[PDB]
Amino acid sequence: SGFYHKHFLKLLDFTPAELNSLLQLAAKLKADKKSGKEEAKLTGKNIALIFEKDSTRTRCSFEVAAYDQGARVTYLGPSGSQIGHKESIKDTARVLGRMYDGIQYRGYGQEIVETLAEYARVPVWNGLTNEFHPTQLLADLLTMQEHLPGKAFNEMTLVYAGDARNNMGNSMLEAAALTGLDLRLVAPQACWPEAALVTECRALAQQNGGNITLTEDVAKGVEGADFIYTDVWVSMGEAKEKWAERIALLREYQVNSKMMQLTGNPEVKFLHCLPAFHDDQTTLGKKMAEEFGLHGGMEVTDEVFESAASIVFDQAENRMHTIKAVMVATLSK
Amino acid sequence: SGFYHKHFLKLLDFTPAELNSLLQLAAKLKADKKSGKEEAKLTGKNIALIFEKDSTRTRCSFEVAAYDQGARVTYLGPSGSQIGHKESIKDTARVLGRMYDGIQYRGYGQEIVETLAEYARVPVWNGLTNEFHPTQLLADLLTMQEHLPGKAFNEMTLVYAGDARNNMGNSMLEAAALTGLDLRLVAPQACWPEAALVTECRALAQQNGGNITLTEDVAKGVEGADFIYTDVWVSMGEAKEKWAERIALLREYQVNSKMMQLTGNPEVKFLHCLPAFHDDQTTLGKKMAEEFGLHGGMEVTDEVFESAASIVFDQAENRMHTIKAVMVATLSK
Amino acid sequence: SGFYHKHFLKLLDFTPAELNSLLQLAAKLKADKKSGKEEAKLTGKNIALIFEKDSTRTRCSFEVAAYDQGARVTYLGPSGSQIGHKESIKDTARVLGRMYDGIQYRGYGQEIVETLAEYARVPVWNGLTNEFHPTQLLADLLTMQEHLPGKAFNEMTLVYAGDARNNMGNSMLEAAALTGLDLRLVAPQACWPEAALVTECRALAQQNGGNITLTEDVAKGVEGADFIYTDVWVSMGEAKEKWAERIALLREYQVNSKMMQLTGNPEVKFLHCLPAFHDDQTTLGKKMAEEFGLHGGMEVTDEVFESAASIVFDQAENRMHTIKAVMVATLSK
Ligand SMILES: N[C@@H](CCCNC(=O)CP(=O)(O)O)C(=O)O
Ligand SMILES: N[C@@H](CCCNC(=O)CP(=O)(O)O)C(=O)O
Ligand SMILES: N[C@@H](CCCNC(=O)CP(=O)(O)O)C(=O)O
């Protein structure tokens, strides 16, 4: 409806109704692809994909969703083009807008994608920025909805442990402000999200029947949750130095078994946007695990990651249907 | 006509008539895409795109132009494949020719793309080499033609300030030799193009009614110009060290407002192939701007870049129609 | 037949009949594309292509073969995505399987691609691993078959000089075990393939009428060969240090003219999977050539590489038909 040629930069630029419509379209599109009745809508549209940070899911998601819908893609990865920086984003935008029908941007800081959106004159979607990550939450919302049918979002309790001031924390706030989820940010105070945003989002959440609780206590936070959610303690783009202090702060907020048990709900499902350092298998996974001693998981224990509660791969699948939905909504009819 | 299976390496391998035909086809194709009546011609053709230097426009241009025409693309960026060097270009060519229908090459030095063309046995297009950049000029010629209708090229005066011995300077010469433009290369003598090429191109320009003037004087050069054109003072692939001496030489050749005023034509339009360091916004843009003191523009002032005279983004758009034209001309019927 | 949803990790996971069927399909598909009667089978299938080592042929091959068959491709090159390592291959697999219909993997070590195949739940093809390279041999087998018509594989003598314990040596063994080729691995003992595999493959080769001979003597090895085959002395992923000892060992195993002459067959054709350091033209080609003194070729003399015996470019072309065949076999009907 009021989606055609709209950008998708952060969730609060949308009404509850818009978000819900979107979520509904995504769900249709998912269902259409499994039934094989997918009607391509974006045929002959060309989309540029600017990536300044790495990505497996978000990139792949944009690519297959476009290919299904009959669109083609151009991946301008981190350093390959002039956009790396040797040219204004303002110029880049004005260039790409003359050739493409839509642009994705993954990067550093909302200023960039906003500037990219003013000047491009085509829909700009936020693939993840330093502050927000709207596309993720769409997928998470739907995944939450698919695992608790017949429940409105205001009937669900979502807990987010970990670093609450990263792009994911910020995005949670927006989600709740639009859905009335009972958000619970279990984090040390040092990692709490900026208060101006909490206030705005809290006010809006309560209007819709939710409430944003922030608390350093794990035990009163996780209680009664339908979902536990967490993320890496240092995000993409933050300095390597942060690891030593972030582990120091956040390790009592690890989503472990005891953690899942303090919930009290045996039906509680775990969520994680991924990548997740859950085992002593990776490159910096093993290095961090021996050094500080996070044996068997950092933000989440490997036992919980491979638990029946873990629905992260469903969540992960839902990234692409969600993005397909955003794209057919902003580019068609 | 005598285009099918021809390479596009430098402009002087074409007749004035050929160039003009090409320009005409481009114009048709542009018009067809805006009207939505674009008939795809390159369906089922596969094209490799070798890039050894960066690119936003040229790469994107090749990609969307192919996608529109129903062709697919394979981007072999700077280091990813064996072509980086671990294998002869001679071998690379012979390999790729067995799989693709056409090959683009962006790189260092004409020898490379020529060798690539002898051995590939499919059309090879020059995406930019150290010496030439033919594809650009096609677009610029058309953009010039679209802003001064009812004017033959011999009725137009084009000034090129800046480093006249880069790939762009060299390309100007070819353009004039084929169009009878009144070329004016306003540059310090130290940056003048190689005399052998000037002579050959001058002779040819004059035959077609033009003349290539070289001069260190800004004032007598810019006078009566229909277009001012410029480019970065150090090109891709040149050593970082060159910046200090090139700024030293070329800063009086900055295209600024006074510069545009000495023209005497109030209808004069500015052109720049881009990227352009016109503001104190970029990475090395700001570093260069404080150090040497180019506040508010290096080759071109930001005031002129955002001037109503600036038609650089039209120019930029015209890169892809032009390339689409080259490709349908060399690959179809 | 028993190909749909099968992985293609190493050749010995297939019967002689399966290999031969495959080879036959490839041959059809080749023929169909030249006649222009190619019926696309993989329309609307999306394929991820994980590359951790470089590639020109294998990547290009996967791309055009997919494009011909109406499929689209996503290239996740060496470091761009999270797969580089920051995430388990086990997780990566489970993610990609939810989005794609098939996955290619080029990398380091068979464990990786096997783990990738257990967890992905879609066909996984081995683009080259440290130990095997099955896709190559398919192409080589067909190329061998196209140059000696009316000859069953058991009627052919294939010699492989050089480093017999790389991924290519190992693959030869598998090929013979399935075809009854008279394999001859002419190599120093220090470079002989692991005996457990030789034994298994020898037993199988003999059943089918072949025999795997290993020998340090060049002269008795090359005698009566229909094909001489060789490869670079240090493979992708091995330490740069190995060059000095590998040249020391292997230079008497260079495929030179005298080498081709000791064969005794004047119809003997040369094969090489490529890249080949055959001239003093490359980056590390020239550096190695002056230092150790391999003037005019390392594994193979440039004279032999450009000889009429050289059919390496036919071989190279046959990489993509072969891969197209693997893909339509594992993804269709
Ligand atoms: N705060 C985290 C969020 C990662 C989001 N993950 C994704 O979007 C999945 P992807 O990396 O595969 O696209 C960070 O910035 O590191
Ligand atoms: N002499 C300049 C020319 C740049 C040409 N620009 C383009 O082709 C536009 P692009 O870089 O976006 O493809 C140089 O070599 O740096
Ligand atoms: N043992 C060699 C094998 C190279 C195989 N070559 C290919 O697959 C051709 P490509 O590199 O163009 O894909 C090595 O590992 O270096």
Side-chain angles (χ1 to χ4, degrees), chain A residues 1-285 288-333, chain B residues 1-285 288-333, chain C residues 1-285 288-333:
Chain A
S1 286
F3 274 124
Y4 182 78
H5 263 236
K6 255 65 279 303
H7 300 299
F8 193 77
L9 308 176
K10 53 192 271 70
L11 288 182
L12 286 171
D13 294 355
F14 293 97
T15 47
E18 279 178 313
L19 176 72
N20 233 265
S21 190
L22 207 46
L23 231 55
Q24 189 190 97
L25 170 61
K28 174 194 152 59
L29 253 42
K30 179 173 190 183
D32 279 30
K33 196 182 174 177
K34 294 187 182 296
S35 283
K37 307 297 292 178
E38 195 182 1
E39 187 187 292
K41 223 70 78 69
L42 305 181
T43 282
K45 297 289 181 176
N46 305 302
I47 301 154
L49 303 183
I50 302 173
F51 274 81
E52 289 199 311
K53 290 169 179 173
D54 300 310
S55 176
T56 299
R57 288 152 285 273
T58 307
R59 147 88 118 115
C60 290
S61 286
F62 264 99
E63 291 228 357
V64 55
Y67 293 148
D68 292 339
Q69 222 62 206
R72 279 78 38 118
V73 149
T74 295
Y75 168 65
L76 298 318
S79 295
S81 323
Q82 304 285 18
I83 177 57
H85 261 243
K86 188 191 174 187
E87 187 169 43
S88 284
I89 42 289
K90 184 179 174 181
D91 296 347
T92 293
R94 292 185 280 191
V95 166
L96 297 180
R98 299 294 268 256
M99 296 176 189
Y100 298 87
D101 298 299
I103 295 171
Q104 192 259 24
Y105 180 76
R106 179 106 147 165
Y108 308 83
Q110 270 277 134
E111 333 120 65
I112 308 297
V113 71
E114 287 183 330
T115 289
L116 190 65
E118 289 180 72
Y119 292 103
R121 263 235 204 118
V122 294
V124 183
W125 314 302
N126 175 20
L128 181 147
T129 193
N130 275 334
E131 295 73 15
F132 296 105
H133 189 16
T135 230
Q136 182 67 57
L137 269 294
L138 278 181
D140 305 317
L141 248 47
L142 180 69
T143 306
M144 279 188 287
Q145 186 189 86
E146 290 190 325
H147 278 250
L148 270 185
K151 294 263 194 164
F153 287 117
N154 62 255
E155 298 183 83
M156 288 163 38
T157 297
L158 171 57
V159 174
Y160 175 80
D163 168 39
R165 57 87 262 153
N166 71 353
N167 50 265
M168 282 305 297
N170 279 331
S171 280
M172 285 300 154
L173 259 53
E174 291 196 294
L178 255 55
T179 54
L181 284 153
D182 176 20
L183 241 197
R184 290 180 207 203
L185 260 51
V186 182
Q189 196 172 105
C191 295
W192 284 0
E194 193 188 292
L197 188 59
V198 178
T199 284
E200 188 178 295
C201 287
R202 188 182 273 138
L204 282 167
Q206 292 187 132
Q207 282 221 101
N208 264 277
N211 192 3
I212 300 179
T213 304
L214 281 66
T215 192
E216 302 186 290
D217 186 32
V218 184
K220 77 182 182 189
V222 299
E223 186 202 80
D226 294 289
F227 301 100
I228 299 302
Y229 196 143
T230 203
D231 191 7
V232 299
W233 295 332
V234 176
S235 300
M236 286 194 270
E238 299 192 299
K240 214 241 173 184
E241 290 68 83
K242 286 287 176 183
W243 274 111
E245 62 179 273
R246 290 285 177 91
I247 290 167
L249 267 57
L250 286 314
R251 63 154 95 210
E252 292 185 288
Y253 296 85
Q254 171 182 84
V255 177
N256 57 69
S257 307
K258 164 71 173 179
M259 228 294 275
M260 297 294 271
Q261 205 166 90
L262 298 175
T263 298
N265 187 206
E267 292 278 88
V268 66
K269 277 165 280 198
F270 178 69
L271 296 160
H272 187 308
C273 56
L274 310 177
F277 300 107
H278 61 85
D279 55 353
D280 320 299
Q281 184 78 40
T282 21
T283 293
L284 57 168
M288 238 97 256
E290 294 299 324
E291 217 74 272
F292 306 92
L294 295 331
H295 291 128
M298 292 185 70
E299 339 86 69
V300 62
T301 284
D302 185 60
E303 174 181 3
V304 185
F305 192 81
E306 300 295 348
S307 191
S310 198
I311 54 170
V312 299
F313 289 112
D314 281 289
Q315 171 181 17
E317 189 200 322
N318 270 336
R319 294 289 316 271
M320 102 77 169
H321 299 295
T322 264
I323 273 172
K324 187 182 285 185
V326 169
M327 285 192 282
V328 302
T330 57
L331 260 30
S332 280
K333 48 194 151 58
Chain B
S1 286
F3 274 124
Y4 182 78
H5 263 236
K6 255 65 279 303
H7 300 299
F8 193 77
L9 308 176
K10 53 192 271 70
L11 288 182
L12 286 171
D13 294 355
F14 293 97
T15 47
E18 279 178 314
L19 176 72
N20 233 265
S21 190
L22 207 46
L23 231 55
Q24 189 190 97
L25 170 61
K28 174 194 152 59
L29 253 42
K30 179 173 190 183
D32 279 30
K33 196 182 174 177
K34 294 187 182 296
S35 283
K37 307 297 292 178
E38 195 182 1
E39 187 187 292
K41 223 70 78 69
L42 305 181
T43 282
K45 297 289 181 176
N46 305 302
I47 301 154
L49 303 183
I50 302 174
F51 274 81
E52 289 199 311
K53 290 169 179 173
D54 300 310
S55 177
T56 299
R57 288 152 285 273
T58 307
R59 147 88 118 115
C60 290
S61 286
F62 264 99
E63 291 228 357
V64 55
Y67 292 149
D68 292 339
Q69 222 62 206
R72 279 78 38 118
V73 149
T74 295
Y75 168 65
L76 298 318
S79 295
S81 323
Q82 304 285 19
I83 177 57
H85 262 243
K86 188 191 174 187
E87 187 169 43
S88 284
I89 42 289
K90 184 179 174 181
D91 296 347
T92 293
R94 292 185 281 191
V95 166
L96 297 180
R98 299 294 268 256
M99 296 176 189
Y100 297 87
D101 298 299
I103 295 171
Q104 192 259 24
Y105 180 76
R106 179 106 147 165
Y108 307 83
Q110 270 277 134
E111 332 120 65
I112 308 297
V113 71
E114 287 183 330
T115 290
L116 190 65
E118 289 181 72
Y119 292 103
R121 263 235 204 118
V122 294
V124 183
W125 314 302
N126 175 20
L128 181 147
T129 193
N130 275 334
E131 295 73 15
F132 296 105
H133 189 16
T135 230
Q136 182 67 57
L137 269 294
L138 278 181
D140 305 317
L141 248 47
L142 180 69
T143 306
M144 279 187 287
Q145 186 189 86
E146 290 190 325
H147 278 250
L148 270 185
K151 294 263 195 164
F153 287 117
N154 62 255
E155 298 183 83
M156 288 163 38
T157 296
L158 171 57
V159 174
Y160 175 80
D163 168 39
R165 57 87 262 153
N166 71 353
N167 50 265
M168 282 305 297
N170 279 331
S171 280
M172 285 300 154
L173 259 53
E174 291 196 294
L178 255 55
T179 54
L181 284 153
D182 176 20
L183 242 197
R184 290 180 207 203
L185 261 51
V186 182
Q189 196 172 105
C191 295
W192 284 0
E194 193 188 292
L197 188 59
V198 178
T199 284
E200 188 178 295
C201 287
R202 188 181 272 138
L204 282 167
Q206 292 187 132
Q207 282 221 101
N208 264 277
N211 192 3
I212 300 178
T213 304
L214 281 67
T215 192
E216 302 186 290
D217 186 32
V218 184
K220 76 182 182 189
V222 299
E223 186 202 80
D226 294 289
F227 301 99
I228 299 302
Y229 196 143
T230 203
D231 191 7
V232 299
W233 295 332
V234 176
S235 300
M236 286 194 270
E238 299 192 299
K240 214 241 173 184
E241 290 68 83
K242 286 287 176 183
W243 274 111
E245 62 179 274
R246 290 285 177 91
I247 290 167
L249 267 57
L250 286 314
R251 63 154 95 210
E252 292 185 288
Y253 296 85
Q254 171 182 84
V255 177
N256 57 69
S257 307
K258 164 71 173 179
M259 228 294 275
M260 297 294 271
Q261 205 166 90
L262 298 175
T263 298
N265 187 206
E267 292 278 88
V268 66
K269 277 165 280 198
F270 178 69
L271 296 160
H272 187 308
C273 56
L274 310 177
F277 300 107
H278 61 85
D279 55 353
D280 320 299
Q281 184 78 40
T282 21
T283 293
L284 57 168
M288 238 97 256
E290 294 299 324
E291 217 74 272
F292 306 92
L294 295 331
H295 291 128
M298 292 185 70
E299 339 86 69
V300 62
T301 284
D302 185 60
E303 174 181 3
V304 185
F305 192 81
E306 300 295 348
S307 191
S310 198
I311 54 170
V312 299
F313 289 112
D314 281 289
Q315 171 181 18
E317 189 200 322
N318 270 336
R319 294 289 316 271
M320 102 77 169
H321 299 294
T322 264
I323 273 172
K324 187 182 285 185
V326 169
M327 285 192 281
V328 302
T330 57
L331 260 30
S332 280
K333 48 194 151 58
Chain C
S1 286
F3 274 124
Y4 182 78
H5 263 236
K6 255 65 279 303
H7 300 299
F8 193 77
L9 308 176
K10 53 192 271 70
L11 288 182
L12 286 171
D13 294 355
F14 293 97
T15 47
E18 279 178 313
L19 176 72
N20 233 265
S21 190
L22 207 46
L23 231 55
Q24 189 190 97
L25 170 61
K28 174 194 152 59
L29 253 42
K30 179 173 190 183
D32 279 30
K33 196 182 174 177
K34 294 187 182 296
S35 283
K37 307 297 292 178
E38 195 182 1
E39 187 187 292
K41 224 70 78 69
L42 305 181
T43 282
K45 297 289 181 176
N46 305 302
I47 301 154
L49 303 183
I50 302 174
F51 274 81
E52 289 199 311
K53 290 169 179 173
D54 300 310
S55 176
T56 299
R57 288 152 285 273
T58 307
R59 147 89 118 115
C60 290
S61 286
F62 264 99
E63 291 228 357
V64 55
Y67 292 149
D68 292 339
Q69 222 62 206
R72 279 78 38 118
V73 149
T74 295
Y75 168 65
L76 298 318
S79 295
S81 323
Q82 304 285 18
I83 177 57
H85 261 244
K86 188 191 174 187
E87 187 169 43
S88 285
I89 42 289
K90 184 179 174 181
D91 296 347
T92 293
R94 292 185 280 191
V95 166
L96 297 180
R98 299 294 268 256
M99 296 176 189
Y100 298 87
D101 298 299
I103 295 171
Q104 192 259 24
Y105 180 76
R106 179 106 147 165
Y108 308 83
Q110 270 277 134
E111 332 120 65
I112 308 297
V113 71
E114 287 183 330
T115 289
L116 190 65
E118 289 180 72
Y119 292 103
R121 263 235 204 118
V122 294
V124 183
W125 314 302
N126 175 20
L128 181 147
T129 193
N130 275 334
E131 295 73 15
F132 296 105
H133 189 16
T135 230
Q136 182 67 57
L137 269 294
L138 278 181
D140 305 317
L141 248 47
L142 180 69
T143 306
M144 279 188 287
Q145 186 189 86
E146 290 190 325
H147 278 250
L148 270 185
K151 294 263 195 164
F153 287 117
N154 62 255
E155 298 183 83
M156 288 163 38
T157 296
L158 171 57
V159 174
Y160 175 80
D163 168 39
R165 57 87 262 153
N166 71 353
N167 50 265
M168 282 305 297
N170 279 331
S171 280
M172 285 300 154
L173 259 53
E174 291 196 294
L178 255 55
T179 54
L181 284 153
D182 176 20
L183 241 197
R184 290 180 207 203
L185 261 51
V186 182
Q189 196 172 105
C191 295
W192 284 0
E194 193 188 292
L197 188 59
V198 178
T199 284
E200 188 178 295
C201 287
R202 188 182 272 138
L204 282 167
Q206 292 187 132
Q207 282 221 101
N208 264 277
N211 192 3
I212 300 179
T213 304
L214 281 67
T215 192
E216 302 186 290
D217 186 32
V218 184
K220 77 182 182 189
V222 299
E223 186 202 80
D226 294 289
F227 301 99
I228 299 302
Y229 196 143
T230 203
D231 191 7
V232 299
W233 295 332
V234 176
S235 300
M236 286 194 270
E238 299 192 299
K240 214 241 173 184
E241 290 68 83
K242 286 287 176 183
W243 274 111
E245 62 179 273
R246 290 285 177 91
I247 290 167
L249 267 57
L250 286 314
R251 63 154 95 210
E252 292 185 288
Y253 296 85
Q254 171 182 84
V255 177
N256 57 69
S257 307
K258 164 71 173 179
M259 228 294 275
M260 297 294 271
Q261 205 166 90
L262 298 175
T263 298
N265 187 206
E267 292 278 88
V268 66
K269 277 165 280 198
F270 178 69
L271 296 160
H272 187 308
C273 56
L274 310 177
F277 300 107
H278 61 85
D279 55 353
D280 320 299
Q281 184 78 40
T282 21
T283 293
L284 57 168
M288 238 97 256
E290 294 299 324
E291 217 74 272
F292 306 92
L294 295 331
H295 291 128
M298 292 185 70
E299 339 86 69
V300 62
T301 284
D302 185 60
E303 174 181 3
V304 185
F305 192 81
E306 300 295 348
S307 191
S310 198
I311 54 170
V312 299
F313 289 112
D314 281 289
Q315 171 181 18
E317 189 200 322
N318 270 336
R319 294 289 316 271
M320 102 77 169
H321 299 295
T322 264
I323 273 172
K324 187 182 285 185
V326 169
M327 285 192 282
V328 302
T330 57
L331 260 30
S332 280
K333 48 194 151 58

